[PDB]
Every structure is written in structure tokens, then in C-alpha cells.
Amino acid sequence: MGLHRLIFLSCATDGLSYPDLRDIMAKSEVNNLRDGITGMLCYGNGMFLQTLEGDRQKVSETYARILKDPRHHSAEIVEFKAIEERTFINWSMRLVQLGEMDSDTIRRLRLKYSPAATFQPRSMTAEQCFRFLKELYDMSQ
Amino acid sequence: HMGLHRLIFLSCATDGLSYPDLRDIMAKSEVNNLRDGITGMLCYGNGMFLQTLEGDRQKVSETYARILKDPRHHSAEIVEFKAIEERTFINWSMRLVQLGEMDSDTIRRLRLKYSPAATFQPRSMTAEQCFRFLKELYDMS
Amino acid sequence: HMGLHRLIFLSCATDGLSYPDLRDIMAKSEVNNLRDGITGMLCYGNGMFLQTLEGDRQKVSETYARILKDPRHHSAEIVEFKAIEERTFINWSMRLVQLGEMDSDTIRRLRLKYSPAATFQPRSMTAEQCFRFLKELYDMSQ
Amino acid sequence: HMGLHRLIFLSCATDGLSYPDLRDIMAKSEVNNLRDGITGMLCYGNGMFLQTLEGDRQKVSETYARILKDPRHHSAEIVEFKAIEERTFINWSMRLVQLGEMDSDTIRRLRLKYSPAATFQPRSMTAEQCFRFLKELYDMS
Amino acid sequence: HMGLHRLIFLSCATDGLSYPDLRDIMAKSEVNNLRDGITGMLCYGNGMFLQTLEGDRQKVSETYARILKDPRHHSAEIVEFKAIEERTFINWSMRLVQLGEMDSDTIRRLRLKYSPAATFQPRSMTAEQCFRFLKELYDMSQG
Amino acid sequence: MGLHRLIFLSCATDGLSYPDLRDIMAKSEVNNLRDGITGMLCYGNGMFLQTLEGDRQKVSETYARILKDPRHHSAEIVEFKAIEERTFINWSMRLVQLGEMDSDTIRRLRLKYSPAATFQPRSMTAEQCFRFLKELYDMS
Amino acid sequence: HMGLHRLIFLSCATDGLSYPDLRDIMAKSEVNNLRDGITGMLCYGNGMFLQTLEGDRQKVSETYARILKDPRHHSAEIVEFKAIEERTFINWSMRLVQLGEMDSDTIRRLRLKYSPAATFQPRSMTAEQCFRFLKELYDMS
Amino acid sequence: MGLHRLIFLSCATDGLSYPDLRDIMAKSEVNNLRDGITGMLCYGNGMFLQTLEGDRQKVSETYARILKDPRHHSAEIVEFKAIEERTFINWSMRLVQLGEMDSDTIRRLRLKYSPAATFQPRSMTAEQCFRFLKELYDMS
Amino acid sequence: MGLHRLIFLSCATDGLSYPDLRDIMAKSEVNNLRDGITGMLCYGNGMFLQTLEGDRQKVSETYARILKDPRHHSAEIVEFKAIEERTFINWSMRLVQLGEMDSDTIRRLRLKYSPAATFQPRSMTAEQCFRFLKELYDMS
Amino acid sequence: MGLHRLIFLSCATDGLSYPDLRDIMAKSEVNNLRDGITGMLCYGNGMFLQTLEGDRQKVSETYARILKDPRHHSAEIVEFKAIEERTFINWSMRLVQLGEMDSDTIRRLRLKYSPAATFQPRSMTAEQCFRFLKELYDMSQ
Numbered sequence A, J: 001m002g003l004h005r006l007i008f009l010s011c012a013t014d015g016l017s018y019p020d021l022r023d024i025m026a027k028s029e030v031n032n033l034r035d036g037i038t039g040m041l042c043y044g045n046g047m048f049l050q051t052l053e054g055d056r057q058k059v060s061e062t063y064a065r066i067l068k069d070p071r072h073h074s075a076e077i078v079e080f081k082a083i084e085e086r087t088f089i090n091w092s093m094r095l096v097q098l099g100e101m102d103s104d105t106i107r108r109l110r111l112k113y114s115p116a117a118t119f120q121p122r123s124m125t126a127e128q129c130f131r132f133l134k135e136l137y138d139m140s141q
Numbered sequence B, D, G: 001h002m003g004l005h006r007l008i009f010l011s012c013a014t015d016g017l018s019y020p021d022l023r024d025i026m027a028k029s030e031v032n033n034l035r036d037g038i039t040g041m042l043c044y045g046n047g048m049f050l051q052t053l054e055g056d057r058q059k060v061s062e063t064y065a066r067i068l069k070d071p072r073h074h075s076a077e078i079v080e081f082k083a084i085e086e087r088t089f090i091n092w093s094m095r096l097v098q099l100g101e102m103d104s105d106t107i108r109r110l111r112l113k114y115s116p117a118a119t120f121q122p123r124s125m126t127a128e129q130c131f132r133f134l135k136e137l138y139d140m141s
Numbered sequence C: 001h002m003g004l005h006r007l008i009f010l011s012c013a014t015d016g017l018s019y020p021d022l023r024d025i026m027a028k029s030e031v032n033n034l035r036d037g038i039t040g041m042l043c044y045g046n047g048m049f050l051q052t053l054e055g056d057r058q059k060v061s062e063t064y065a066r067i068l069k070d071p072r073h074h075s076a077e078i079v080e081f082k083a084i085e086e087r088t089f090i091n092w093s094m095r096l097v098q099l100g101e102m103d104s105d106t107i108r109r110l111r112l113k114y115s116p117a118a119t120f121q122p123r124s125m126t127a128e129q130c131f132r133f134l135k136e137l138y139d140m141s142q
Numbered sequence E: 001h002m003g004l005h006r007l008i009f010l011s012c013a014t015d016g017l018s019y020p021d022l023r024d025i026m027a028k029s030e031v032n033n034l035r036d037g038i039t040g041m042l043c044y045g046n047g048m049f050l051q052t053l054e055g056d057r058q059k060v061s062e063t064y065a066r067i068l069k070d071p072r073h074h075s076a077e078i079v080e081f082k083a084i085e086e087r088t089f090i091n092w093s094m095r096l097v098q099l100g101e102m103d104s105d106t107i108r109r110l111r112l113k114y115s116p117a118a119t120f121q122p123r124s125m126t127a128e129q130c131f132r133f134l135k136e137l138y139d140m141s142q143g
Numbered sequence F, H, I: 001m002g003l004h005r006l007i008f009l010s011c012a013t014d015g016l017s018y019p020d021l022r023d024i025m026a027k028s029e030v031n032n033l034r035d036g037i038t039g040m041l042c043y044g045n046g047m048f049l050q051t052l053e054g055d056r057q058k059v060s061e062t063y064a065r066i067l068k069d070p071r072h073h074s075a076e077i078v079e080f081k082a083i084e085e086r087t088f089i090n091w092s093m094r095l096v097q098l099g100e101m102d103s104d105t106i107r108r109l110r111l112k113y114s115p116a117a118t119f120q121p122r123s124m125t126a127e128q129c130f131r132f133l134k135e136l137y138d139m140s
């Protein structure tokens, strides 16, 4: 039924540590590679913003799995639509931490695509979330 | 906030699904969706569920997260999630439409109009086809 | 003289607003707006105000700055201000529509049509949703 | 949360406006705008102000309502207020540009480029001209 | 021959304009415009003229140069001049519409519809607003 | 009511002299700077092709004065419309004479934007006159 | 072949054209155009011809090449030649409409609607005006 | 992969019989109903013009089978694309014979959508074939 | 009525000689220069493909004279429409012989804009002919 | 009737050999050159994906011949439409084998234009097949 892209956000569980983030990256890369899924996970200011690209069914099944994870709560879908080609091609999953990135670059990128004084993905539109993640992916290459 | 959205998803009915089960689903959704500002429509046929929800980005997502935990269906597949200027499915907090209790010639034309399948197969339908199929049902009701 | 414009804004009615308040707002609004070439419509429901004003860029702005000084409401939020080819809200210099003095079902369906909320919440509505909500009310009030 | 918006307004500076008065304005705007997630640009020339603010619909409104109470100007005119997909005035929570301290030729050409007036007259300019005028100022900083 | 065009302009009527003045204008516009393949409509109201002319690029220009020389009005403003695929104002070489001989409420709402002004002020209206205002006048008073 | 552009053409009156041109350019520069008007005047093959940018009322009044000038006759308006920004920014008024340019570059420019073997602005559309003038202005 | 096309051209009647000439033109046109799959419409008025032919790119061209050798007119000028998705002038292999036998006011308004002229002057008309002019004449028959 | 529509044309083999047409119609109706396929068959002037809607795979497989039928030759694909909704809903396969309908209606229809003096789908674009088949279908 | 472009094709008459080609080019340069006409004539595979830009009347009359020339036959109009600017500016008439150019540049060009295994303008659309001719002109 | 493009896919019959491919390329190179046909053949993961550009009739007949070939089975048409210009100009027929290429560029190219974890033209849209083929043609010059 074709290639799709999903974008959703969520609130991280309190006290998340680096080993927790690395654990997410490690399982996501293996499962996604198996499932034909690509994407990117953005972490900052206690919030997750993720995009997954792939088959309509596979991406749905992965999202239903991600909802069971106790490392986050209060998930919101931002968008689900058919896409002509992938944007997030290179990584089965890439984690980007806004805190390990140039303070100035991120502030300008977060301002560019958002009205918020901090990283607040609930205040961004679907196209803003996409373009935010696209620039993170393009610089994190 | 963030605005009005519509979700469209499909799923498989669990084997043994009973009319009571159908009525229990409708009873709880109507109370919940009314509380949440959610309207929409549930189509059941050929062992398949095809549903749409309209409302707040967060609320619809939370309702979908709850629906994913229901054992009365399995293998849910998201069809689309996007922002909308206005609602189509205004009249009912949640309306159940059974394809089997309907004019066989009306439903045959409808299912053919918006799908390539010889029976009702939402998995073979695009997001636009599911929207238009459901809308004709809503209008016919 | 920069053409015809439309402003849309919303606000919270102040606690204790009474029918005399609504009449005073309408009485001054009709006189000022007729003087200023301003037309529009004010919607009241669920403790919220939703209003649109059409006219000259300077006049409408001046009318809005006066409105922000009015103690009969608070927490104003601008929804949209843009140039327009033609007016939609032609007939009245100002018209009050109370959502509660109307067919509950017609309004319930309209409030659902153009918003995600279980109640009248103009802060949850877009500029296009506010305009189309207001236009349908205007078309029914004729 | 109804998304990112841009406000543009103009006003007349009250007589006697002083250099310390402008610096005070710039000092409070940077603090307030940074607090509120707001960015923008203030233009001063020919006794007139032309400013733009980007950010949240509610915050920008509340900021305009505060600016309207300031005795250092009068006769404000809204030029446009609308939703935007991305910010243009990303770099400064607030920046002052004095047209009088700029190349008489660079500013004269820019003033003619975007208005029919022989002097700076933002009231004679469309929303698009004010935007494009302020943007070139922004790009020259 | 560069095709069909439309001109829209406005002006202030000179003080003391009389009904015979409007009649001399109308009798002469009809004869000249019929000769020159020009059609159009003149609106008079609130001491202001708002007129449109359709025809050949050169003919319309010359008629405007003639109109500019007339002492019966002053302070003309061009609102628009462009090529058009087809005429809107076809039925009359020139038709005069006086806003005062028409339904106040009909004209009132029409003037608000296409302008920000509390009275008829073509100087506050765009080319498109002027076009649409004149077109509704032309359509309603087909007589 | 915003920034507008006018383009018109005309026939020069027989006996046009440089002094004649000197008076035109001198009063135009003064008058246009006062009025917020910019533009360009093209002369060639006995024809004027002009563009003026500025306020709707000002540009019109200037056109009315230009129509009284006896140094030319048979004006035609080419277009009058609103514009987002000026193209002809640099000069309150600039004269360009086609005859004092490469017999090759202008031949082309003209042929590019007209069906005629000589400069015949009555044969050009509004968009052809604009682009033709924009190319001339862009050269200086 | 290479598709359905429409040609529109105009010409001046050779001075002294007679009714029998027009008859003979119409009789050859119906026979030839019917043989060649060509349809169209010929307007005559004020000493001018305005005609359109629809059909094969080759057939219409050759027929036009034959019309060019006819001494009953001169000064032919092509108005338009392009590919078309469907015919407008379907009903007749060739139909003659004389502007001289029509409601004097109907023809006056039609000529004014699609021309800057006080007389029928097809040389003063664009390709779209000729098309719309002939189409209205066709619809009144 | 979704709903598609195919259009193809061919020459009927010499000797085509009404019984021949009926075997085609009967086997097509059964197979297409099995295959979720709908469509329309046009026959005139010795030519076939057909459209099928359904699954990309299914429609292709049916076309491959049509290519082996000896009752026609010189098949030519006209169009194959994804479609949002079916136009040819009502019948799995419906035969419309051009030659036995109103002579004037089919003359106008065939002229409307083609440069030819007889039915010649080889002279028609994809859109012409589609709009032609659709007007036939709408008349049934 | 402004600037137009014509595109047409024809078959060269049997026996066409280089002097014949040189005379066509010679009279075309004079007539077109007088008539304000520019364009390009492409000769290949025994076929002519030409385009002319200029005034609507002049271009037509020139086409009518071209139709009486016995050095070619079977003319087909490809397209005739209004244009905003000339593409074939530099030359009142220029010959491009496909045979005197790189077989590979021309082979690739001919495939890009046609379904044919050789140069066959009768198989090309108006847009394909224009773009074909424009690439020749730009590389010329 | 102009230039067209066909795209189709099929399953290679079991046991396909290098000689098998050489014979396919050999006749296709000859036949397409005779027919004015250009195109490209992609082989990978036991699947064929091909495009042919040329005349509507010739391309159709070449497809009819290809369907009789027993070296593949289960052919599926992807798209057939008229085109303004060719994309695959340089070759009458060129074979590209995905396994004789860099796992990365092919893997990422294949992910770019499909949801699948391996090459599966059956899950690809018409526009994805075209773009997949076009990047292959562009790389192998």
C-alpha cells in the first residue's frame, strides 16, 4: 500500500539517562532495519520528537509497540500520510540530543520552526516538525 | 491546542466478535468521545473495522492509544492523520455502520467505487478512498 | 488609505457581565462603527467573545486599541488581520449574536464543524475556522 | 497553542522621543521577548515606528496590548497579523534599526523600492512591502 | 491594433454641476464612443465620478485625454488600465448611473461591500473593487 | 492606495531638439523627486516609451501634465496597475536614446520583445514594454 | 495519426463576392470536410471571413493550403493552430453564418464583447476572442 | 498498490461472430467479478476499445490473458494509471456495439473525441478514449 | 495583434540540391529581415522543420508563399500561437542541417523529443518541435 | 500518437543464468534500436523492473512479445502514459544488476523510493519506479 511517514512526539519519563537513550537507539536500529523502517529521534527539554518512514502496516505496528514503552508517556501523533520518497534515508534510527548540539544553532532552529522559548514540539505544526527534523538530519550527517 | 485533526485507521475484528461486544464498544466510545470533543464513525464489515475520529491532536491520539489496547480487534493499521479546516463527521460522537445490514447493491457499488477488491478490504484502499467511502456512509446515514 | 481590511479577535468576558453591559457595548459600537465606516459582528458564548471588524486599516486598528482598554473583557488575543477584496459582514455596523439564544442543536453542530472543542473555545480555532464560524452565524441572523 | 504568527504594526513616535528612551525600549523588549519566545525587529525613521513580532498567537497579542499602553508612541496601525510556517526574524528577540544612521543612498533606494513616498511613510505601504522592507534591514544586520 | 482594453478612472465633479451638464456629457459620450468602438459606464455620486471605458488601446487613451481637458471635473485618478479578454460593459456606449436615483440601502451595502468608506469614496477603493462596484451597478440597472 | 506603475507611449513632435530634451529631463527630475515618482524615458525611431512608478494620484497628475506638453502628441496608455515593488528605482527620470547605442544590442532587444523591424511600441504589449524597459535600465 | 487540432484563420472576401460564390464554397466544403473528418464554421460579415476547422493535423493543414489558392478571398491571416482535447464545432462539416442576417443587436453585442471594434474586424481580435465569438455563433444554431 | 485503470484497443480478427462476442462477454463477466475488475468493451468499425479497473496485478494478468485470445490482434495499450475512484462501476464487463446505436449520437460522439471520419481509437488520445468510453457508459 | 510563432513541417522534393538550399536561405534572409521575421529552418532525413516568429499577418503571408514553392511538398502546420518574447532572435532565417552535425548529439536530441528511430517531425508534438528547434538554435 | 513510456515488473524464472541475461540484452538491443525504443532493465532480488520509451504501438507490441518469454513470470504493468521527452535516451536497452553494486548506494537508493527492506518493485508506485530507474540510469553513465 506504499511508503508512509509518521511523526509523533511524547514526554520523556523523569530521570532518563544516557544508557536508556542508547538502549532505545540499539533496539530501534535492529527492529527498524528488519521492518524496512527509517527515521530519526530527537530528544530535548524532556520531550521526544520522532519520525518513522516505511510501510503503512509496519510503521503502525512499531508505533503501537512504542506506545507500550515506559520510558515516555503522553504521546501525540503529529502526522501520518503517504509520501513519494523518503527524507530520512541513511539511518534505521538516529538519536539527536539537542543538549549535545551547538547551543546557538539549536536555539535558532527551534525558533525558526516553533513559537516556543524552549523545545516544545506540542506547539509545532506537522510541516514544522518535519522541517525541524530534516535540518537536524542534514546537519547530523 | 494545535487544531482540528482527523484520524483514519483500520483493524481486524477478533474472531468471535459479538453484537453485545459491538454495543459495548459503542456505549463507551459515545460517552468518552463526547467528553473529549471527538466525533467520528465506525464501519464494520467482512471482519474488518474502518474508523475515523475528528478532534484535538492530543485527544484523538490518546483515544487511539486506548483503542490499541482493546482485544476485541487486532492488527490495527493507521490510514491517515492530518489537520482539517472543518469536520465532516459532525453529527455523531460515534456512529456504528454495519455493511452487512445494508442494501447489498448500495454497498457493492460503494466498495467498488473506492477500492480494487471484490469484497470490503480497507487494507487495499488509500487514505482518500477511505475518507470518501466513510463520508458516503455518513451521508447515507 | 491602504484599502479594506478585516480583523478577527477573541477575549474572555469579565466576571459579572450583565445584559446592560452587552447593550452598552452594542450602543456605542453601532455609533462609532457607523461613523468610522466599520462593519462587523460580535459573538458571545461560554464566557467568550469572538468578533470580526471590517474597514480601513487605521480605523479598525484604532477601534481595537479602544477595545483593549475596555474593562468589560480581558485576555484579548488577535486571530487575524489582513487586507480583503470585499466585506463579508456587510449589513451591520455591529451585531450581537449570543450562542445561547439560538437553536442548541444548530449551534452544537456549528461549533463542532469549526473547532476541536467540546464547548465554544475560540482560542482553539484557526483564523479560517473563526471566519467561517462567524460567516455562518451572520448568514443565519439575516 | 495555535502556532507561530507574525505581527507587523506601525506607530507615530511621541514628540521629544529621546535616545535613552529608545535604549530603554530595546532593553525591556529583549528581556520580555526572550521570556515569551518572541523575536522581531524595530525600525525607526522620520518620526515613525515599523516593527514586526514573531511567536505565539496569544503571547504576541499580549505583547501588542502592552506596547499600546506605552506613552512613547501613539496612533498605532496594525499592518498584518497571520500564521506563518517559519520565522524570518530569527536572530534577535528584538533589534533596533535607525534609518537615520544608515547610508542615505542604501536607505533611500530601499525606501523607494517598497513604498510610493518620498520619505519613510509606513502608512503608505502594504503588508508585503513592510515585510520585505524589514527583511532587507534584517538581512543587512 | 493591440486588442481590447479597459480603463478605470475617478475624478471630482466641478462645483455647480447641473443636470443639463450630465446630459451634455451623456449625449456627447454616446456619439463619440459609438464612433470609436468604445463602451462603458459613468457613476456619479457624492460629488465624485467613477467611470470605466472599454475599447481599443489608442482610442480609449485619446478619449481620456479629451476627458482630462473638460472643466466639468478635476483631480482625476487613474485606477486601472489593462488588456481584457472580453467586455463587461457591453450594452451602452455610455450609461450614466446616479447613485442618488437608486435604492439607498442597495447602494449603501454595495458601497460598503467594495470599500472601507462611510460614504462613496472611490479614492479608497482598489482597481478590483471599482470594477466589481461598477459591474453590480451595470447589472442591476439594465432598465 | 499604494505603489503603482504607468507605462505610456507617444510620438515626438517634429523638430525635437536637445535643449527640448534638456528641459524635459530637468523639470522631470525636479517634479518627480518632489512627488516620489521614479521612472525611465526611452526615445528612438521618433517615439517615446515611458514608465513612471509612484503613488496612484501623483503618477496620474503627472500624466495629465505630460498630456499638455506640446513637444509630443498621440499618447497611448500601455498599462496602469498596482505593483509590489519598484523596478525603476535609481532615477527620478532617466532618458535613454536608442539611436546612440550598438546597432546590434538594441536591434536584438527590440526584436526580442516586439514583432517589428524597428522600434514600434504601438506594436508591443504591456509586458513587452516593461521587460524591454527593464533591460534598458539594467544596462545602466 | 497525431491528434485532433483546431485552426482558426481570417481573410478578406475578394471584392465582388456574390451569393452563388458563397453557395459554391459551402457545397465544396461540406463534401470535402465530410470526407476528411473535418468540422468547422465560417463567419462572413463586413467583407471579411472568419473560419475555424477541426480535425487531423495533416488534413486541416492541406485543406487550409487549398483554401489559400481560392481567388474568392485574399489576405489570409492565421489566428491560431493548436491541439485540442475535444471538438467544439461538432454538428457540421461546414456551416455558414452571415452577420448580415442576425438580430442587429445580438451581433452588435457579440462583436463588442469579443472585439475593440465598431464593425466586424477579425484582424483586431485575439485567438481566444475569435474562438469564443465563433462558439457563441455556433451555439445559436 | 491500489486502484488502476487500463485502456487498450485492438483489431477484431476476421470472422468475428455474435456467438464469438457472447463467449467473450460471458467469460469476462465471470473472471472480472472474481478478480474485483470492472470495465467496458466498445466494438465498432472492426475495432475494440476496452477499459478495465481494478488491482494493478489483477488488471495486468487479465490483459496478459487478453493478449493470447485469437479473436483479436494488433493490441495497443492506450493508458495505465492509478485512479482515485472507479468510473466504470456498474458492470464487470459490458459490451456496447457502436454500429447498432443511434447513427447521429455516435457520429457526434466519435467526432467529439477524434479527428477521424470513422471509429479509429488509434487516432485518439488517452483522455479522448476515456471520455468516449464514459459517455457510452453513462448512456446505459 | 502582436508577436506570434509558427511551426510547420514538409517533405523536401526529390533532387533537392545544395544550390537549392542556398537560394532558399538567401531569399529567406531578405524577406524575413524586411518583414520583421526571425526563425530557424532545420533540414534532415529529407524532412523540413521550420519555425517563424513575427507579426501575425506577415508570418501568415510568408507561410502562404512558402506553400507555393515547388522545392518541398506535404506541408503540415504544427502550431501557431502568440508569444511574449522571441526565442529565435539572432537570425532572420538560419539553416541547420542535421547531416552536417555530430551524429550522436543529433541522435540523442532526436530521441529525446520523438518516438522515431530517425528524424520524423510528423511524429512530434508542437512542444517537442519547439524544444527540439531551440536546442539546435542554442547549440548554433 | 507520440512518445510514450511503459514501466513493468516481473519475477525472473528460477535458474536464470548469465547467458540468459546476455541473450535478453542481445535481442532487446537489436529490436529496440529497430523500433525507436530506448529503455532500461533492472535486475535484483529475483525481480525485474523495466521501462521502455517509444511509440505507443511499438512499445505495446514489444510488451506483448515480452509476455511470451518464459525467462520470467508474473508480469505486472506499473504505468503507461504519454511523455513530453525521453529520460532513458542513451541506450536501446541497458541491464543494471543491483547485486553487482555497492550495498550502500543501492540499499539507500532502494530505501529512498520504496518501503521494503529489499528490492520489491511490487510495493513501489509508478513515480517511485521511474525515479528509481532514473537515478540508476544517471549513475551508470
Ligand SMILES: Cc1cc2nc3c(=O)[nH]c(=O)nc-3n(C[C@H](O)[C@H](O)[C@H](O)COP(=O)(O)O)c2cc1C
Pocket: A010, A024, A027, A028, A029, A031, A032, A039, A041, A048, A050, A052, A062, A065, A066, A067, A068, A069, A071, A072, A093
Ligand atoms: C521515544 C522512543 C522511541 C522508540 N522508537 C522505536 C523505534 O523506532 N523502533 C523500535 O523498534 N523501537 C522503538 N522504541 C522502543 C520500543 O518501545 C521497544 O522497547 C522495542 O521495540 C522493544 O522491542 P521488542 O519487544 O520486539 O524486543 C522506542 C522507544 C522510545 C521510548
Ligand SMILES: Cc1cc2nc3c(=O)[nH]c(=O)nc-3n(C[C@H](O)[C@H](O)[C@H](O)COP(=O)(O)O)c2cc1C
Pocket: B011, B025, B028, B029, B030, B032, B033, B040, B042, B049, B051, B053, B063, B066, B067, B068, B069, B070, B072, B073, B094
Ligand atoms: C474498533 C473499535 C473502536 C473503538 N473506538 C473507540 C472510540 O472511538 N472512542 C472510545 O472512547 N473508545 C473506543 N473503543 C474502545 C476502547 O478500546 C476502550 O474500550 C474504551 O476507550 C474504554 O474506555 P474506558 O476508559 O471508559 O474504559 C473502540 C474499540 C474498538 C474495538
Ligand SMILES: Cc1cc2nc3c(=O)[nH]c(=O)nc-3n(C[C@H](O)[C@H](O)[C@H](O)COP(=O)(O)O)c2cc1C
Pocket: C011, C025, C028, C029, C030, C032, C033, C040, C042, C049, C051, C053, C063, C066, C067, C068, C069, C070, C072, C073, C094
Ligand atoms: C467584546 C467587545 C467588543 C467591542 N466592540 C466595539 C466595536 O466594534 N466598536 C466600538 O466602537 N467599540 C467596541 N467596544 C467598546 C470599546 O471598548 C469602547 O468602550 C467604545 O469604543 C467606547 O467608545 P467612546 O469612548 O468613543 O464613547 C467593544 C467592547 C467589547 C468588550
Ligand SMILES: Cc1cc2nc3c(=O)[nH]c(=O)nc-3n(C[C@H](O)[C@H](O)[C@H](O)COP(=O)(O)O)c2cc1C
Pocket: D025, D028, D029, D030, D032, D033, D040, D042, D049, D051, D053, D063, D066, D067, D068, D069, D070, D072, D073, D094
Ligand atoms: C515602538 C515600541 C516597541 C516596543 N516593543 C516591545 C516589545 O517588542 N516587547 C516588549 O516587551 N516591549 C516592547 N515595548 C515596550 C512596552 O511598551 C512596555 O514598556 C513593555 O512591554 C513593559 O513590560 P512590563 O509589564 O514587564 O513592564 C515597545 C515600546 C515601544 C515604544
Ligand SMILES: Cc1cc2nc3c(=O)[nH]c(=O)nc-3n(C[C@H](O)[C@H](O)[C@H](O)COP(=O)(O)O)c2cc1C
Pocket: E011, E025, E028, E029, E030, E032, E033, E040, E042, E049, E051, E053, E063, E066, E067, E068, E069, E070, E072, E073, E094
Ligand atoms: C466624468 C466625465 C466623463 C466623460 N466621459 C466621456 C466619454 O466617455 N466619451 C466622450 O467622448 N466624452 C466624455 N466626456 C466629455 C469630454 O471631456 C469632452 O467634453 C467630450 O469628449 C467632447 O467631445 P468632442 O469635443 O469630440 O465633441 C466626459 C466628461 C466627464 C466630465
Ligand SMILES: Cc1cc2nc3c(=O)[nH]c(=O)nc-3n(C[C@H](O)[C@H](O)[C@H](O)COP(=O)(O)O)c2cc1C
Pocket: F010, F024, F027, F028, F029, F031, F032, F039, F041, F048, F050, F052, F062, F065, F066, F067, F068, F069, F071, F072, F093
Ligand atoms: C515624453 C515626455 C515625458 C515627460 N515626462 C515627465 C515626467 O516624468 N515628469 C515630469 O514632471 N514632467 C515630464 N514631462 C514634462 C511635462 O509634460 C511638463 O512639461 C512638466 O511636468 C512641466 O513642469 P512644471 O509643471 O513644473 O512647469 C515629460 C514630457 C515629455 C514630452
Ligand SMILES: Cc1cc2nc3c(=O)[nH]c(=O)nc-3n(C[C@H](O)[C@H](O)[C@H](O)COP(=O)(O)O)c2cc1C
Pocket: G011, G025, G028, G029, G030, G032, G033, G040, G042, G049, G051, G053, G063, G066, G067, G068, G069, G070, G072, G073, G094
Ligand atoms: C473563405 C473560404 C473558406 C473555405 N473553407 C473550406 C473548407 O472548410 N473546406 C473545403 O474543402 N473547402 C473550403 N473552401 C474552398 C477551397 O478553397 C476549395 O475551393 C475546395 O476545397 C475545392 O475542392 P476540390 O478538392 O474538389 O478541388 C473555402 C473557400 C473560401 C473562400
Ligand SMILES: Cc1cc2nc3c(=O)[nH]c(=O)nc-3n(C[C@H](O)[C@H](O)[C@H](O)COP(=O)(O)O)c2cc1C
Pocket: H024, H027, H028, H029, H031, H032, H039, H041, H048, H050, H052, H062, H065, H066, H067, H068, H069, H071, H072, H093
Ligand atoms: C476484446 C476482448 C476482450 C476481452 N476481455 C476480457 C476481460 O475483460 N476479462 C476476461 O477475463 N477475459 C477477457 N477476454 C477473454 C480472454 O481472452 C480469455 O478468453 C479469458 O480470460 C479466458 O479465461 P479462462 O482462464 O477462464 O479460460 C477478452 C477477449 C477479447 C477478444
Ligand SMILES: Cc1cc2nc3c(=O)[nH]c(=O)nc-3n(C[C@H](O)[C@H](O)[C@H](O)COP(=O)(O)O)c2cc1C
Pocket: I010, I024, I027, I028, I029, I031, I032, I041, I048, I050, I052, I062, I065, I066, I067, I068, I069, I071, I072, I093
Ligand atoms: C523549407 C522552405 C522554407 C522557406 N522559408 C522561407 C522563409 O522563411 N522566408 C521566405 O521569405 N521564404 C522562404 N521560403 C521560400 C518561398 O517558398 C519563396 O521561394 C521565397 O519567399 C521567394 O519569394 P519572393 O521572391 O516573391 O519574395 C522557403 C522555402 C522552403 C522550401
Ligand SMILES: Cc1cc2nc3c(=O)[nH]c(=O)nc-3n(C[C@H](O)[C@H](O)[C@H](O)COP(=O)(O)O)c2cc1C
Pocket: J010, J024, J027, J028, J029, J031, J032, J039, J041, J048, J050, J052, J062, J065, J066, J067, J068, J069, J071, J072, J093
Ligand atoms: C525482463 C525481460 C525484458 C525483456 N525486454 C525486451 C526488450 O526490451 N525488447 C525486446 O525486443 N525483447 C525483450 N525481451 C525478450 C523477448 O521476450 C523476446 O525474447 C525478444 O523480443 C526476441 O523477439 P524476436 O526474437 O521474436 O525478434 C525481454 C525479456 C525479459 C525476460
